[PDB]
Amino acid sequence: SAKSRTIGIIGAPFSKGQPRGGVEEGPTVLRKAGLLEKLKEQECDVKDYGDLPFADIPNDSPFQIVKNPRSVGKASEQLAGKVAEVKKNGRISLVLGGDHSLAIGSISGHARVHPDLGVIWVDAHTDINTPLTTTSGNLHGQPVSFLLKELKGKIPDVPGFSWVTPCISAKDIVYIGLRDVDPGEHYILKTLGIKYFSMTEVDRLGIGKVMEETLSYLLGRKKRPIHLSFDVDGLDPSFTPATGTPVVGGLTYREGLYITEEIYKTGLLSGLDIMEVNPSLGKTPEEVTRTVNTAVAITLACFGLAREGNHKPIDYLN
Amino acid sequence: SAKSRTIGIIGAPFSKGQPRGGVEEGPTVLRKAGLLEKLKEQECDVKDYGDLPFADIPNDSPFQIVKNPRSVGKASEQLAGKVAEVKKNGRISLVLGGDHSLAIGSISGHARVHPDLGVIWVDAHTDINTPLTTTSGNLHGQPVSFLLKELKGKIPDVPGFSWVTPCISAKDIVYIGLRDVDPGEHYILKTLGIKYFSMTEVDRLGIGKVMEETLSYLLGRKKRPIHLSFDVDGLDPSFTPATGTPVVGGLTYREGLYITEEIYKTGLLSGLDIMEVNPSLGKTPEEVTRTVNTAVAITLACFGLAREGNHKPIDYLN
Amino acid sequence: SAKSRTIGIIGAPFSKGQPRGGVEEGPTVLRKAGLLEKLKEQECDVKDYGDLPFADIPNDSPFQIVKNPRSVGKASEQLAGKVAEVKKNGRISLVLGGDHSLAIGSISGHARVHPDLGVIWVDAHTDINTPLTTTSGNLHGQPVSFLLKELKGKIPDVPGFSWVTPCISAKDIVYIGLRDVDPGEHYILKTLGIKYFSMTEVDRLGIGKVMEETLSYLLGRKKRPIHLSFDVDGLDPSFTPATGTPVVGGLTYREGLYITEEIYKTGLLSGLDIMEVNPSLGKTPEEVTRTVNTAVAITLACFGLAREGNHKPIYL
Ligand SMILES: [C]N([C])[C][C]1[C][C][C]([C][C][B]([O])([O])[O+])[C][C@]1([N])C([O])=O
Ligand SMILES: [C]N([C])[C][C]1[C][C][C]([C][C][B]([O])([O])[O+])[C][C@]1([N])C([O])=O
Ligand SMILES: [C]N([C])[C][C]1[C][C][C]([C][C][B]([O])([O])[O+])[C][C@]1([N])C([O])=O
Ligand SMILES: [Mn+2]
Ligand SMILES: [Mn+2]
Ligand SMILES: [Mn+2]
Ligand SMILES: [Mn+2]
Numbered sequence: 001s002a003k004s005r006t007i008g009i010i011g012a013p014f015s016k017g018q019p020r021g022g023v024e025e026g027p028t029v030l031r032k033a034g035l036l037e038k039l040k041e042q043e044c045d046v047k048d049y050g051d052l053p054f055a056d057i058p059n060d061s062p063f064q065i066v067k068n069p070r071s072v073g074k075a076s077e078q079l080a081g082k083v084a085e086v087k088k089n090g091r092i093s094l095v096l097g098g099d100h101s102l103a104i105g106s107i108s109g110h111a112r113v114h115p116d117l118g119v120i121w122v123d124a125h126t127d128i129n130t131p132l133t134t135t136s137g138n139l140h141g142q143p144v145s146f147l148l149k150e151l152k153g154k155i156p157d158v159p160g161f162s163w164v165t166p167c168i169s170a171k172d173i174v175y176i177g178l179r180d181v182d183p184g185e186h187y188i189l190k191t192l193g194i195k196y197f198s199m200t201e202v203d204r205l206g207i208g209k210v211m212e213e214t215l216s217y218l219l220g221r222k223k224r225p226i227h228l229s230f231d232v233d234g235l236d237p238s239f240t241p242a243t244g245t246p247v248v249g250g251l252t253y254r255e256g257l258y259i260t261e262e263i264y265k266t267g268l269l270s271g272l273d274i275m276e277v278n279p280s281l282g283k284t285p286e287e288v289t290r291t292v293n294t295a296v297a298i299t300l301a302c303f304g305l306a307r308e309g310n311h312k313p314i315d316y317l318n
Numbered sequence: 319s320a321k322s323r324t325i326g327i328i329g330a331p332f333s334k335g336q337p338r339g340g341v342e343e344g345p346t347v348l349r350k351a352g353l354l355e356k357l358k359e360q361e362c363d364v365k366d367y368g369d370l371p372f373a374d375i376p377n378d379s380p381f382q383i384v385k386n387p388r389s390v391g392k393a394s395e396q397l398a399g400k401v402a403e404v405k406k407n408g409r410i411s412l413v414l415g416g417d418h419s420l421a422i423g424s425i426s427g428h429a430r431v432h433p434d435l436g437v438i439w440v441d442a443h444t445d446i447n448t449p450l451t452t453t454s455g456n457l458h459g460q461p462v463s464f465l466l467k468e469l470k471g472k473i474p475d476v477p478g479f480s481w482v483t484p485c486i487s488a489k490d491i492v493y494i495g496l497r498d499v500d501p502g503e504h505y506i507l508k509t510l511g512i513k514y515f516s517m518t519e520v521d522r523l524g525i526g527k528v529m530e531e532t533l534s535y536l537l538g539r540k541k542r543p544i545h546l547s548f549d550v551d552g553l554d555p556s557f558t559p560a561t562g563t564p565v566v567g568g569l570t571y572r573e574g575l576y577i578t579e580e581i582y583k584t585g586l587l588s589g590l591d592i593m594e595v596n597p598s599l600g601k602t603p604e605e606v607t608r609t610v611n612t613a614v615a616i617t618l619a620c621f622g623l624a625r626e627g628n629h630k631p632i633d634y635l636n
Numbered sequence: 637s638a639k640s641r642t643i644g645i646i647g648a649p650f651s652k653g654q655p656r657g658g659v660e661e662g663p664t665v666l667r668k669a670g671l672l673e674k675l676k677e678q679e680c681d682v683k684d685y686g687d688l689p690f691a692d693i694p695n696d697s698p699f700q701i702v703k704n705p706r707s708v709g710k711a712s713e714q715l716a717g718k719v720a721e722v723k724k725n726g727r728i729s730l731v732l733g734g735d736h737s738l739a740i741g742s743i744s745g746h747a748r749v750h751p752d753l754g755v756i757w758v759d760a761h762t763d764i765n766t767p768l769t770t771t772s773g774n775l776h777g778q779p780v781s782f783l784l785k786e787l788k789g790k791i792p793d794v795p796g797f798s799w800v801t802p803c804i805s806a807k808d809i810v811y812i813g814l815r816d817v818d819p820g821e822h823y824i825l826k827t828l829g830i831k832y833f834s835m836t837e838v839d840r841l842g843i844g845k846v847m848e849e850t851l852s853y854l855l856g857r858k859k860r861p862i863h864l865s866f867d868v869d870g871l872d873p874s875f876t877p878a879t880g881t882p883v884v885g886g887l888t889y890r891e892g893l894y895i896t897e898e899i900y901k902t903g904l905l906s907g908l909d910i911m912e913v914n915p916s917l918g919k920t921p922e923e924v925t926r927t928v929n930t931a932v933a934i935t936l937a938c939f940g941l942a943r944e945g946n947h948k949p950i951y952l
């Protein structure tokens with residue numbers, strides 16, 4: 001019942017942040033996999049807040065090229081209200097997600113309770129396109145732009161995103177696993193001086209130094225809450241094939257566990273997003289089972305499960 | 319040949335330390351792949367001491383929940399005498415194994431001739447449950463507890479193991495590759511302060527520094543014979559799938575060869591166990607061939623094979 | 637475009653340096669995957685010098701055990717000629733290869749214009765067998781032996797290789813990825829003191845320290861042109877299965893990109909070989925697709941593609 005193992009589960013069955021349908025079943029397959037039980041199998045305080053209901057906005061006309069903006073803005077608006085609710089209740093928010101546009105609400109609602117948070121973004125992509133730089137028009141590739149304070153005056157008024165007040169600065173976010181960056185995204189990345197560890201860096205330094213540099217960069221000045229937004233495609237498709245945008249050359253299964261293991265040991269985890277699990281895009285039933293089983297193992301390591309073993313505070317020899 | 323390449327081969331077709339049948343064929347398939355001939359091709363002096371006849375023990379009721387204790391204890395007792403015999407002949411004992419419970423006999427008979435030995439234990443598991451902390455009753459996940467001096471007093475009188483005397487100390491064994499550890503094992507691991515590199519530590523430091531710390535921890539004070547107990551499930555199941563208890567996220571083929579190449583270069587390899595190859599557990603015939611090939615390759619690196627190249631002390635240009 | 641992105645492309649559909657047919661289709665499948673256009677989409681100045689026509693030599697009698705000496709010798713002689721020409725045009729020679737015996741011509745022609753070049757050899761093998769140390773007799777395992785000045789006199793007079801002049805010293809080549817070396821090659825490797833990073837060294841040091849030590853070893857004294865000879869079997873068969881001699885335990889896709897990404901940032905890439913892609917050696921159509929696409933990615937990384945992203949100095 002430690003703070004590190006005190007959890008509030010929020011389901012976010014949302015998919016309109018991206019074209020490929022099925023990512024809304026994310027919260028369903030993760031629950032079906034036995035996540036809450038396996039969390040309770042560890043010494044975890046688990047309270048389920050259910051699946052957020054998302055109202056179907058039938059006529060959600062696009063903003064220029066950005067599609068379904070009112071639907072994405074409302075879903076994140078509900079998530080922000082719900083995330084802050086479980087944070088004021090002392091629990092670590094565990095958003096069980098569809099597409100990564102929900103990171104707007106998850107981080108915002110987290111920010112209303114802990115405005116001094118830092119963000120670790122595990123992803124293959126930066127998701128830092130603005131509504132003017134996007135070529136896909138999909139909002140799951142834009143959430144960071146709505147959330148950075150330095151990007152104010154650059155974000156046009158998108159219908160449904162009026163409640164969005166930027167809550168993090170460029171110095172309070174670190175990327176791990178980038179290997180598919182748009183040209184506009186790369187421009188923002190280097191112009192803001194955002195700390196990132198692309199797969200070039202992970203190869204160069206190893207996931208060991210990557211985590212060492214990541215945590216000290218974020219927890220150097222002061223100790224502050226950590227929000228980990230984990231996009232399942234941050235790991236190689238050989239472990240998470242059932243996702244919207246897979247890119248080869250990703251983080252290994254071991255590296256994904258080591259990231260989450262090292263973040264748990266800081267004791268400062270405060271919010272978690274497990275996004276972009278799509279049980280429709282599995283070429284076989286095993287590809288979905290493999291993806292879900294991987295996202296579950298990632299989450300369990302976020303809350304104490306260590307590869308070296310775990311044990312309760314008793315004498316097992318008596 | 320030289321001392322590092324003078325080998326005495328002991329087939330150990332025993333399976334009653336674990337539930338799944340077939341691991342007794344381990345010696346058969348390893349020989350069939352040509353392990354003897356490939357060792358001789360790299361200037362090894364190899365003597366084949368034959369496959370040990372393990373007489374049937376029909377009345378072998380369980381000790382509490384521990385299964386087949388007398389068959390396991392006598393096979394390890396017979397292996398212990400056999401290993402000590404080849405060590406007295408000046409040869410490196412090579413045990414081609416069934417289940418890992420034979421390590422009780424492999425290490426004990428080794429210690430009888432070389433009581434100052436150190437153990438490197440490559441495995442996904444710690445194999446350190448006592449007959450009382452075990453929940454599976456399978457003796458192949460208990461051999462280390464029988465061998466540790468610091469556990470004297472916690473091993474009950476198990477039928478078949480009255481010959482057993484703990485021969486190695488807690489500071490004379492190093493684990494590499496752990497990722498599947500029972501809570502009672504984790505308690506024992508930490509309380510006795512055993513040196514270990516789980517998959518987490520291998521991810522943090524890399525196999526290069528792991529082997530540098532391993533060999534310095536064991537050989538730093540004084541040089542001494544090394545005993546390597548290699549469980550095949552220490553590597554990832556993508557390389558050794560034909561094994562009893564495969565666990566995802568293991569050491570790679572490269573990492574397995576680097577461990578064994580580094581151990582050879584010390585010139586202090588004295589005993590070697592190649593355990594848990596179960597040719598009946600491959601989902602396809604190729605998976606069996608792939609497991610055996612990896613096992614043969616790791617055995618060949620133990621006795622001189624190097625990826626950088628090998629050559630005889632002659633003038634290849636005449 | 638900039639020097640590091642101005643390329644002359646040479647297709648070398650040659651296979652008679654090795655016994656498995658199909659590697660001559662390397663240039664065809666690589667073009668077919670759109671390699672040229674993909675290079676142009678990242679602001680590269682691409683000039684296509686076409687595929688080299690290799691005439692058939694009927695009376696190609698063996699030189700002892702060495703097979704097809706006059707076809708291999710003439711093919712590399714032509715490639716050396718065409719590589720010197722693109723080098724004279726101030727372009728980076730990109731050789732879309734068949735078997736690795738063509739490196740005899742690629743490096744010789746490159747050394748004709750830049751005799752101070754340094755070679756990086758990404759390969760599971762050393763390819764340093766002499767015509768007398770070889771047991772296979774396949775010349776795609778002998779190219780480095782013809783190129784090293786320190787082995788002059790150890791190489792017999794082989795028909796087809798009278799034009800060859802040893803053009804690099806053993807102190808100017810760095811091997812990366814070794815894991816299958818013949819006894820005679822390893823003797824040569826140790827005797828001549830060639831700098832090398834086998835899979836053992838990549839395991840021990842990591843790909844980052846290997847690249848830093850490689851670039852420092854070749855360019856520490858002074859800037860000079862770099863010739864990258866990339867045998868596709870340097871990567872693990874799980875990423876490049878459609879090749880003649882797959883060896884397990886190879887460089888990862890990531891390590892291949894990292895090597896090529898780091899080589900680009902020096903701005904000194906001057907010659908490139910993409911060798912030993914054999915589309916007829918894939919057990920499934922996907923295995924061919926995987927091998928080519930991996931080869932394509934390694935190539936684009938040699939000319940600026942970066943996993944962290946790219947952008948023109950234009951976006952806000
Ligand atoms: C190819 N580019 C043009 C589009 C590309 C598509 C996939 C998304 C993935 C977002 B996530 O990693 O959260 O699934 C990012 C992207 N950059 C964009 O902006 O839509
Ligand atoms: C998971 N627990 C419940 C049991 C677990 C099963 C697998 C064995 C592996 C033995 B070996 O390393 O020889 O393959 C170890 C184990 N600890 C035990 O004690 O049987
Ligand atoms: C088996 N050994 C004895 C021979 C071996 C076969 C494969 C070639 C690979 C050439 B390449 O690296 O260009 O694909 C090297 C080799 N040394 C030789 O010389 O033929
Ligand atoms: Mn994302
Ligand atoms: Mn095991
Ligand atoms: Mn074991
Ligand atoms: Mn090769």
Ligand SMILES: [Mn+2]
Nearest residue numbers: 736759763867
């Ligand atoms: Mn080659």
